[PDB]
Amino acid sequence: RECSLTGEWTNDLGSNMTIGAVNSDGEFTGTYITAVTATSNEIKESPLHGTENTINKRTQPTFGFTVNWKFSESTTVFTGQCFIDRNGKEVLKTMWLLRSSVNDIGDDWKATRVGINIFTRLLT
Amino acid sequence: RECSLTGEWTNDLGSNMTIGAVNSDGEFTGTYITAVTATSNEIKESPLHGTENTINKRTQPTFGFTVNWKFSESTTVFTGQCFIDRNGKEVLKTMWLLRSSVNDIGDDWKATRVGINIFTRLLT
Amino acid sequence: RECSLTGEWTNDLGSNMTIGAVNSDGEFTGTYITAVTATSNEIKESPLHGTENTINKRTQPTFGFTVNWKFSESTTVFTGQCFIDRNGKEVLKTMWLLRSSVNDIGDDWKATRVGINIFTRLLT
Amino acid sequence: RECSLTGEWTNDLGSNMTIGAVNSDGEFTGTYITAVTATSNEIKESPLHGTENTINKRTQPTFGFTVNWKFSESTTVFTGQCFIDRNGKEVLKTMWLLRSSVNDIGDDWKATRVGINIFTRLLT
């Protein structure tokens, strides 16, 4: 009971993220510090904005967030669920869609990549 | 001339959405309206928060947004690009991931559905 | 009643495909003539191999097929259903995954694109 | 030395598969075995047909295959790449789409689930 979103997280590929307080409407903003950037870069930070679903006030709520990349013209969306694992650790399981910017509508069909990411807490 | 997100749109599925005004930051708010399991209790509306990529102030920007469902524990993410010419008409080309809430971590693998939607200006 | 796979089909982007006879096990092979090839080419043909699901002998059966590209190192998989539309026309609704070849396992996360395709019959 | 498809594998989900021998053409056959809704009636097995891309006889080829379910009307497609070093161990990195059968064309949009699976050599 209590899979909270707020905090610092790290994922399976080296990226880090920090999520602030979740308001009443279930809204939150935060930051994303990436690793893999289809040309990995030093340490570039971008903002994120999402919501957590509050229907039935579930302890392992679903969520979604958009990453507004600051060193590229692409956009990434992440969706998933905040779980309490068998060992009592908080875990974010996610899938994501990476939209690349094309010039012509005739190339739209190849602008979308898909994948997953797993996050666990940092704070230490 | 540019492809603006602000406004009223409808999709190939007959769903409609409204998008507020886009802040300097690329941030926006709106509403998503669908025929919640059509019939039973007609149509419902759920908020939606997202961003538009503004790097290099492109004319046909990429964006993404999260729809926080008001009648289910689910969450949906959309990402795509705002296009022009094909007549001179604005087109929203998107893909989404719909995440269902699951009770146990072992059921995670079957919680994500994926698809597309094309949005056009509301005949008005 | 009778959404059959055998034949010549064309899709929403200009690609063509011909599917041969479906055997007992539900197996079939055929050919794929593409249009968009992340660098569109004249007229390059590649073979395909898939199966149709025969459980309950459904009239609008699900299916899957793999395209073994002959001018590239990638692979594409297609899945969907063979429908009888309101107007009595046969229609294939599909989603597909395009795997690109990477050199290092550290780039695996970006090797997968997703999309859709709609096919209808040719034969005229 | 190369990454061979032929053999016995198991996945992160505890499912197992066998793959026959790969013909000149890149064609292969096998079997997929899972715990069909574990308990009720333990494990079941379903055939599987696919191909391996052989352009430029790469050491870590891409491939795809269709699993024709024997206890449901569903169809599943997998696509990925066969990798090496990480110790000297072969890894199958894949993504799939699972298509459910729907009764009416208007329900098509919710028929496709997407995910990943990592396969490793069967401890034997």
Coordinates of C-alpha atoms in Angstrom, one line a residue:
Chain A
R1 CA 0.0 0.0 0.0
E2 CA 1.3 3.4 -1.2
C3 CA 3.1 3.4 -4.5
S4 CA 4.0 7.1 -4.5
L5 CA 5.3 9.0 -7.7
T6 CA 7.2 11.9 -6.1
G7 CA 11.0 11.4 -5.8
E8 CA 14.1 10.4 -7.7
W9 CA 14.2 7.5 -9.9
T10 CA 16.6 5.8 -12.1
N11 CA 16.1 3.4 -15.0
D12 CA 17.5 0.3 -16.7
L13 CA 19.6 2.3 -19.1
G14 CA 21.2 4.9 -16.9
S15 CA 18.6 7.7 -17.2
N16 CA 17.5 9.6 -14.1
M17 CA 14.3 11.5 -13.3
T18 CA 12.9 13.5 -10.6
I19 CA 9.3 13.9 -9.9
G20 CA 7.8 16.6 -7.7
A21 CA 4.6 16.7 -5.7
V22 CA 1.4 15.3 -7.1
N23 CA -1.5 17.8 -6.8
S24 CA -5.2 17.1 -6.2
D25 CA -6.1 16.7 -9.9
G26 CA -3.3 14.1 -10.0
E27 CA -0.9 16.5 -11.8
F28 CA 2.9 16.6 -11.6
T29 CA 5.9 18.0 -13.3
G30 CA 9.6 17.2 -13.1
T31 CA 12.8 16.5 -14.8
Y32 CA 14.3 14.0 -17.0
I33 CA 18.1 13.5 -17.3
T34 CA 18.9 11.2 -20.1
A35 CA 21.5 8.7 -21.2
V36 CA 20.5 7.3 -24.5
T37 CA 19.6 10.0 -27.0
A38 CA 19.8 8.4 -30.4
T39 CA 23.3 9.9 -30.1
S40 CA 23.8 10.0 -26.3
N41 CA 25.0 13.3 -24.9
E42 CA 26.8 14.5 -21.8
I43 CA 24.1 15.5 -19.4
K44 CA 21.2 17.3 -20.9
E45 CA 18.1 17.9 -18.9
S46 CA 14.5 18.3 -20.1
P47 CA 11.2 18.9 -18.4
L48 CA 8.3 16.5 -18.1
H49 CA 4.6 16.9 -17.3
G50 CA 2.1 14.2 -16.6
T51 CA -0.9 12.9 -14.6
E52 CA -1.6 10.0 -12.3
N53 CA -5.0 8.3 -12.4
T54 CA -7.0 8.7 -9.2
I55 CA -10.1 6.8 -9.9
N56 CA -10.9 4.6 -6.9
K57 CA -7.9 5.9 -5.2
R58 CA -5.9 2.8 -6.2
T59 CA -2.6 2.1 -4.3
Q60 CA -0.9 1.0 -7.5
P61 CA -2.1 3.7 -9.8
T62 CA -1.7 4.0 -13.6
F63 CA 0.1 7.2 -15.0
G64 CA 1.3 9.0 -18.1
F65 CA 3.9 11.8 -18.8
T66 CA 5.3 13.7 -21.8
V67 CA 9.0 14.6 -22.1
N68 CA 9.6 17.8 -23.9
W69 CA 13.2 17.4 -25.2
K70 CA 15.4 20.4 -25.0
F71 CA 18.2 19.4 -27.5
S72 CA 16.1 17.8 -30.2
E73 CA 12.9 18.3 -32.1
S74 CA 11.3 15.0 -30.9
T75 CA 8.8 14.1 -28.3
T76 CA 8.5 11.1 -26.0
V77 CA 5.5 9.8 -24.1
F78 CA 5.6 7.3 -21.2
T79 CA 2.7 5.3 -19.7
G80 CA 2.5 2.6 -17.0
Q81 CA 1.9 1.6 -13.4
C82 CA 3.4 2.1 -10.0
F83 CA 3.7 -1.3 -8.3
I84 CA 4.7 -2.6 -4.9
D85 CA 7.0 -5.6 -5.8
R86 CA 7.1 -9.0 -3.9
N87 CA 10.1 -7.7 -1.9
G88 CA 8.3 -4.4 -0.9
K89 CA 10.2 -2.1 -3.3
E90 CA 8.5 0.5 -5.4
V91 CA 8.7 -0.1 -9.1
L92 CA 7.5 1.8 -12.3
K93 CA 6.8 -0.4 -15.2
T94 CA 6.6 1.6 -18.5
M95 CA 6.2 1.6 -22.2
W96 CA 7.0 4.6 -24.3
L97 CA 6.6 6.1 -27.7
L98 CA 9.3 8.3 -29.4
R99 CA 8.0 10.6 -32.0
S100 CA 10.6 11.9 -34.4
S101 CA 10.0 15.0 -36.5
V102 CA 9.6 14.4 -40.3
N103 CA 9.5 17.1 -43.0
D104 CA 6.8 15.6 -45.1
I105 CA 3.6 14.0 -44.3
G106 CA 4.6 11.2 -46.8
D107 CA 7.2 10.0 -44.3
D108 CA 4.9 9.9 -41.3
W109 CA 4.9 6.1 -41.2
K110 CA 8.3 5.9 -40.1
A111 CA 8.4 8.5 -37.4
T112 CA 7.5 6.2 -34.4
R113 CA 9.6 4.0 -32.3
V114 CA 8.4 2.0 -29.3
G115 CA 10.0 0.5 -26.2
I116 CA 10.0 -0.1 -22.4
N117 CA 11.8 1.2 -19.4
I118 CA 11.9 0.1 -15.7
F119 CA 12.5 2.5 -12.9
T120 CA 13.4 2.0 -9.2
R121 CA 14.2 4.5 -6.5
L122 CA 17.4 6.3 -6.0
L123 CA 17.5 8.4 -2.8
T124 CA 20.4 7.2 -0.7
Chain B
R1 CA 1.7 29.5 -42.2
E2 CA 2.1 27.4 -39.1
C3 CA 0.0 24.3 -37.8
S4 CA -1.7 25.4 -34.5
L5 CA -2.7 23.0 -31.8
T6 CA -5.3 25.3 -30.2
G7 CA -8.8 24.7 -31.3
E8 CA -11.4 22.0 -31.8
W9 CA -10.8 18.6 -33.4
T10 CA -12.5 15.3 -34.1
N11 CA -11.1 12.0 -35.0
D12 CA -11.5 9.1 -37.3
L13 CA -13.3 7.3 -34.4
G14 CA -15.7 10.3 -34.0
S15 CA -14.2 11.4 -30.7
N16 CA -13.6 15.2 -30.2
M17 CA -11.1 17.3 -28.4
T18 CA -10.5 20.8 -27.4
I19 CA -7.2 22.4 -26.8
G20 CA -6.6 25.5 -25.0
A21 CA -3.9 28.1 -25.7
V22 CA -0.3 27.1 -25.9
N23 CA 2.0 28.9 -23.4
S24 CA 5.5 30.2 -24.2
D25 CA 6.8 27.1 -22.7
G26 CA 4.9 24.9 -25.2
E27 CA 2.4 23.8 -22.5
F28 CA -1.2 23.2 -23.1
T29 CA -4.5 22.0 -21.5
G30 CA -7.7 20.6 -23.1
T31 CA -10.6 18.2 -23.0
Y32 CA -11.2 14.8 -24.5
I33 CA -14.6 13.6 -25.2
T34 CA -15.8 10.2 -26.2
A35 CA -18.9 7.9 -26.3
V36 CA -18.0 6.0 -23.1
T37 CA -19.0 2.5 -24.2
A38 CA -21.7 4.2 -26.3
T39 CA -25.3 3.8 -25.2
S40 CA -25.2 2.9 -21.5
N41 CA -24.6 6.5 -20.5
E42 CA -23.8 8.4 -23.8
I43 CA -20.7 10.7 -23.8
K44 CA -18.3 11.7 -21.0
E45 CA -15.3 14.2 -20.8
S46 CA -11.9 13.9 -19.3
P47 CA -9.1 16.5 -18.9
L48 CA -5.8 16.3 -20.9
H49 CA -2.4 17.9 -20.3
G50 CA 0.5 18.0 -22.9
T51 CA 3.4 19.8 -24.6
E52 CA 4.5 20.9 -28.1
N53 CA 8.2 20.8 -29.0
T54 CA 9.4 24.3 -29.9
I55 CA 13.1 23.7 -30.7
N56 CA 13.8 25.6 -33.9
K57 CA 10.3 26.9 -33.9
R58 CA 9.2 24.4 -36.6
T59 CA 6.0 25.0 -38.6
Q60 CA 4.8 21.4 -38.1
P61 CA 5.8 20.6 -34.6
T62 CA 5.7 17.3 -32.6
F63 CA 3.8 17.0 -29.4
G64 CA 2.3 14.6 -26.9
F65 CA -0.3 14.6 -24.3
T66 CA -1.8 12.4 -21.5
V67 CA -5.6 11.9 -21.2
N68 CA -6.5 11.2 -17.5
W69 CA -9.7 9.1 -17.8
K70 CA -12.6 10.1 -15.6
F71 CA -14.6 7.0 -15.7
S72 CA -11.9 4.3 -15.5
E73 CA -8.6 3.7 -13.9
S74 CA -6.9 3.6 -17.3
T75 CA -4.5 6.2 -18.7
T76 CA -3.9 7.0 -22.4
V77 CA -0.9 8.7 -24.1
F78 CA -0.8 10.2 -27.6
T79 CA 2.1 11.5 -29.5
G80 CA 2.4 12.8 -33.0
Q81 CA 3.0 15.8 -35.4
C82 CA 0.8 18.7 -36.5
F83 CA 0.9 18.8 -40.5
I84 CA -0.3 21.3 -43.3
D85 CA -0.7 21.0 -47.1
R86 CA -2.7 18.1 -48.5
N87 CA -5.1 20.8 -49.6
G88 CA -4.1 23.5 -47.1
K89 CA -5.8 21.7 -44.2
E90 CA -4.2 21.0 -40.7
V91 CA -3.8 17.3 -39.8
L92 CA -3.0 15.7 -36.5
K93 CA -1.2 12.3 -37.2
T94 CA -0.9 10.4 -33.8
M95 CA -0.3 7.0 -32.1
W96 CA -1.2 6.1 -28.6
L97 CA -0.7 3.6 -25.8
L98 CA -3.6 2.7 -23.5
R99 CA -2.6 1.3 -20.2
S100 CA -5.0 -0.7 -18.2
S101 CA -4.7 -1.0 -14.4
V102 CA -3.7 -4.6 -13.3
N103 CA -3.8 -6.0 -9.9
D104 CA -0.6 -7.8 -9.8
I105 CA 2.9 -7.2 -11.0
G106 CA 2.9 -10.5 -12.8
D107 CA 0.1 -9.4 -15.1
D108 CA 2.0 -6.4 -16.4
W109 CA 2.8 -7.8 -19.7
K110 CA -0.7 -7.7 -21.0
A111 CA -1.7 -4.2 -19.8
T112 CA -0.8 -2.2 -22.9
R113 CA -2.7 -1.6 -26.1
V114 CA -1.4 0.4 -29.0
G115 CA -2.9 2.2 -32.0
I116 CA -3.4 5.2 -34.1
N117 CA -5.8 8.2 -34.6
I118 CA -6.0 11.0 -37.2
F119 CA -7.5 14.3 -36.0
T120 CA -9.0 17.1 -38.3
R121 CA -10.6 20.5 -37.6
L122 CA -14.1 20.4 -36.4
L123 CA -16.5 21.3 -39.2
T124 CA -17.0 24.7 -37.7
Chain C
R1 CA -18.9 -15.0 -44.4
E2 CA -15.6 -16.0 -46.0
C3 CA -12.8 -13.5 -45.5
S4 CA -10.2 -15.4 -47.6
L5 CA -6.3 -14.5 -47.5
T6 CA -5.3 -15.8 -51.0
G7 CA -5.0 -13.2 -53.7
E8 CA -3.6 -9.8 -54.6
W9 CA -3.8 -6.9 -52.3
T10 CA -2.8 -3.3 -52.1
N11 CA -2.3 -1.0 -49.2
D12 CA -2.8 2.6 -48.1
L13 CA 0.7 3.6 -49.1
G14 CA 1.1 2.0 -52.5
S15 CA 2.6 -1.3 -51.5
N16 CA 1.3 -4.5 -53.2
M17 CA 1.2 -8.1 -52.0
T18 CA 0.2 -11.4 -53.3
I19 CA -0.7 -14.3 -51.1
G20 CA -0.9 -17.9 -52.3
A21 CA -3.0 -20.9 -51.1
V22 CA -3.5 -21.4 -47.4
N23 CA -2.8 -25.0 -46.5
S24 CA -4.4 -27.2 -43.8
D25 CA -2.1 -26.0 -41.0
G26 CA -3.2 -22.5 -42.0
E27 CA 0.2 -21.8 -43.6
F28 CA 0.9 -19.5 -46.6
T29 CA 3.7 -17.8 -48.4
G30 CA 3.8 -15.0 -50.8
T31 CA 5.2 -11.8 -52.0
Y32 CA 5.6 -8.3 -50.9
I33 CA 6.3 -5.4 -53.4
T34 CA 7.1 -2.3 -51.5
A35 CA 6.7 1.4 -51.8
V36 CA 8.1 3.0 -48.7
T37 CA 11.5 1.6 -47.7
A38 CA 13.0 4.2 -45.4
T39 CA 14.5 5.3 -48.7
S40 CA 11.8 4.1 -51.2
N41 CA 13.2 2.1 -54.1
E42 CA 12.1 1.3 -57.7
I43 CA 10.4 -2.1 -57.5
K44 CA 12.1 -4.5 -55.1
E45 CA 10.3 -7.7 -54.2
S46 CA 10.6 -9.8 -51.0
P47 CA 9.1 -13.0 -49.8
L48 CA 6.7 -13.4 -46.9
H49 CA 5.7 -16.4 -44.8
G50 CA 2.9 -16.5 -42.2
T51 CA -0.1 -18.4 -40.7
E52 CA -3.8 -17.8 -40.3
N53 CA -5.5 -18.9 -37.1
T54 CA -8.0 -21.7 -37.6
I55 CA -9.4 -22.2 -34.1
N56 CA -13.2 -22.4 -34.3
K57 CA -12.9 -22.0 -38.0
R58 CA -13.8 -18.3 -37.7
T59 CA -15.0 -16.4 -40.9
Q60 CA -12.9 -13.3 -40.0
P61 CA -9.7 -15.0 -38.8
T62 CA -6.7 -13.4 -37.2
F63 CA -3.3 -13.8 -38.9
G64 CA 0.5 -13.0 -38.9
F65 CA 3.3 -12.9 -41.4
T66 CA 7.0 -12.1 -41.5
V67 CA 8.6 -10.1 -44.4
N68 CA 12.2 -11.2 -45.2
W69 CA 13.6 -8.0 -46.9
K70 CA 15.9 -8.7 -49.8
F71 CA 17.6 -5.3 -50.1
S72 CA 18.1 -4.5 -46.5
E73 CA 19.1 -6.2 -43.2
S74 CA 15.8 -5.5 -41.5
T75 CA 12.8 -7.6 -40.6
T76 CA 9.1 -6.7 -40.5
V77 CA 6.3 -8.5 -38.9
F78 CA 2.5 -7.9 -39.6
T79 CA -0.5 -9.0 -37.5
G80 CA -4.2 -8.5 -37.9
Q81 CA -7.7 -9.6 -38.9
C82 CA -9.5 -10.3 -42.2
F83 CA -12.8 -8.5 -42.0
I84 CA -16.0 -8.3 -44.1
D85 CA -16.8 -4.6 -44.1
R86 CA -20.4 -3.1 -44.0
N87 CA -20.4 -2.8 -47.7
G88 CA -19.4 -6.5 -48.2
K89 CA -15.7 -5.8 -49.2
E90 CA -12.8 -7.8 -47.8
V91 CA -10.5 -5.8 -45.7
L92 CA -7.2 -6.6 -43.8
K93 CA -6.6 -4.4 -40.8
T94 CA -2.9 -4.6 -39.6
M95 CA -0.2 -3.4 -37.3
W96 CA 3.4 -4.0 -37.9
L97 CA 6.8 -3.9 -36.3
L98 CA 9.9 -3.0 -38.1
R99 CA 13.1 -4.3 -36.7
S100 CA 16.3 -2.5 -37.7
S101 CA 19.7 -4.2 -37.4
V102 CA 22.0 -2.5 -34.8
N103 CA 25.7 -3.3 -34.2
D104 CA 25.8 -3.2 -30.5
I105 CA 23.4 -4.6 -28.0
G106 CA 23.6 -1.1 -26.2
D107 CA 21.6 0.4 -29.0
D108 CA 18.8 -2.2 -29.0
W109 CA 16.4 0.2 -27.5
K110 CA 16.0 2.2 -30.6
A111 CA 15.8 -0.6 -33.1
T112 CA 12.0 -0.8 -33.2
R113 CA 9.4 1.2 -35.2
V114 CA 5.7 0.5 -35.1
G115 CA 2.7 1.4 -37.4
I116 CA -0.4 0.3 -39.3
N117 CA -1.4 -0.6 -42.7
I118 CA -4.8 -1.2 -44.4
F119 CA -5.2 -3.6 -47.4
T120 CA -8.0 -4.1 -49.9
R121 CA -8.2 -6.3 -53.0
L122 CA -6.8 -5.6 -56.3
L123 CA -7.8 -8.2 -59.0
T124 CA -9.5 -6.3 -61.8
Chain D
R1 CA 31.5 -16.8 -33.8
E2 CA 27.9 -16.3 -34.9
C3 CA 24.5 -16.2 -32.9
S4 CA 22.5 -19.3 -34.0
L5 CA 18.7 -19.4 -33.8
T6 CA 18.5 -23.2 -33.7
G7 CA 18.1 -24.7 -30.3
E8 CA 16.2 -24.4 -27.0
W9 CA 15.3 -21.1 -25.3
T10 CA 13.4 -19.8 -22.3
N11 CA 12.2 -16.3 -21.5
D12 CA 11.9 -13.8 -18.8
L13 CA 8.3 -14.9 -18.5
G14 CA 9.3 -18.6 -18.0
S15 CA 8.0 -19.7 -21.4
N16 CA 10.2 -21.9 -23.6
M17 CA 10.7 -22.4 -27.3
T18 CA 12.4 -24.7 -29.6
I19 CA 13.7 -23.8 -33.0
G20 CA 14.5 -26.2 -35.7
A21 CA 17.2 -25.9 -38.3
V22 CA 17.5 -22.8 -40.5
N23 CA 17.3 -23.5 -44.2
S24 CA 19.5 -21.9 -46.8
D25 CA 16.6 -19.5 -47.5
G26 CA 16.6 -18.3 -43.8
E27 CA 13.4 -20.3 -43.1
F28 CA 12.7 -22.0 -39.8
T29 CA 10.1 -23.9 -37.8
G30 CA 9.7 -24.5 -34.0
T31 CA 7.5 -24.8 -31.0
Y32 CA 6.3 -22.4 -28.4
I33 CA 5.3 -23.6 -25.0
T34 CA 3.6 -21.6 -22.3
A35 CA 1.5 -22.1 -19.1
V36 CA -1.9 -21.5 -20.7
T37 CA -3.5 -19.5 -18.0
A38 CA -1.4 -21.5 -15.5
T39 CA -3.3 -24.0 -13.4
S40 CA -6.6 -24.8 -15.0
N41 CA -4.8 -27.2 -17.5
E42 CA -1.0 -26.6 -17.0
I43 CA 1.1 -26.1 -20.2
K44 CA 0.3 -26.3 -23.9
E45 CA 2.3 -26.1 -27.1
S46 CA 1.7 -24.3 -30.4
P47 CA 3.7 -24.3 -33.7
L48 CA 5.7 -21.3 -34.9
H49 CA 7.1 -20.4 -38.4
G50 CA 9.6 -17.5 -39.2
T51 CA 12.7 -16.2 -41.0
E52 CA 16.1 -14.9 -40.3
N53 CA 17.5 -12.1 -42.4
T54 CA 20.7 -13.2 -44.2
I55 CA 21.6 -10.1 -46.3
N56 CA 25.4 -9.6 -45.8
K57 CA 25.5 -12.8 -43.7
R58 CA 25.6 -10.8 -40.4
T59 CA 26.8 -12.4 -37.2
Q60 CA 23.9 -11.1 -35.2
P61 CA 21.0 -11.3 -37.5
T62 CA 17.4 -9.9 -37.2
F63 CA 14.4 -12.2 -37.6
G64 CA 10.7 -12.6 -36.9
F65 CA 8.3 -15.3 -36.4
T66 CA 4.5 -15.9 -36.0
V67 CA 3.1 -18.2 -33.2
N68 CA -0.2 -19.7 -34.3
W69 CA -2.0 -20.3 -30.9
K70 CA -3.6 -23.7 -30.5
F71 CA -6.0 -22.9 -27.7
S72 CA -7.2 -19.4 -28.7
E73 CA -8.2 -17.6 -31.8
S74 CA -5.3 -15.1 -31.2
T75 CA -2.1 -14.7 -33.2
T76 CA 1.3 -13.4 -31.9
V77 CA 4.2 -11.9 -33.8
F78 CA 7.8 -11.5 -32.5
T79 CA 10.6 -9.7 -34.1
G80 CA 14.1 -9.0 -32.8
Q81 CA 17.9 -9.6 -33.1
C82 CA 20.2 -12.5 -32.1
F83 CA 23.1 -10.9 -30.0
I84 CA 26.6 -12.2 -28.5
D85 CA 29.1 -10.8 -26.0
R86 CA 27.9 -9.7 -22.6
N87 CA 29.9 -12.5 -21.3
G88 CA 30.0 -14.6 -24.5
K89 CA 26.3 -15.7 -24.1
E90 CA 23.7 -15.6 -27.0
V91 CA 20.6 -13.3 -26.3
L92 CA 17.4 -13.0 -28.1
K93 CA 16.1 -9.3 -27.8
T94 CA 12.4 -9.2 -29.1
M95 CA 9.1 -7.3 -29.2
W96 CA 5.8 -8.6 -30.0
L97 CA 2.2 -7.7 -31.0
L98 CA -0.6 -10.0 -29.7
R99 CA -3.8 -9.7 -31.8
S100 CA -7.1 -10.7 -30.4
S101 CA -10.0 -11.8 -32.5
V102 CA -12.8 -9.2 -32.5
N103 CA -16.4 -9.7 -33.7
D104 CA -16.9 -6.5 -35.5
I105 CA -14.8 -4.1 -37.6
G106 CA -15.7 -1.3 -35.3
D107 CA -13.9 -2.9 -32.5
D108 CA -10.6 -3.2 -34.3
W109 CA -8.9 -0.4 -32.4
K110 CA -8.6 -2.2 -29.2
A111 CA -7.5 -5.6 -30.5
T112 CA -3.6 -5.1 -30.3
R113 CA -1.4 -5.5 -27.3
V114 CA 2.3 -4.8 -27.5
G115 CA 5.4 -5.9 -25.4
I116 CA 8.8 -7.3 -25.0
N117 CA 10.5 -10.6 -24.2
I118 CA 14.2 -11.5 -23.7
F119 CA 15.2 -15.2 -24.5
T120 CA 18.3 -17.1 -23.2
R121 CA 19.7 -20.6 -23.8
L122 CA 18.0 -23.2 -21.8
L123 CA 20.2 -24.3 -18.9
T124 CA 21.1 -27.5 -20.7

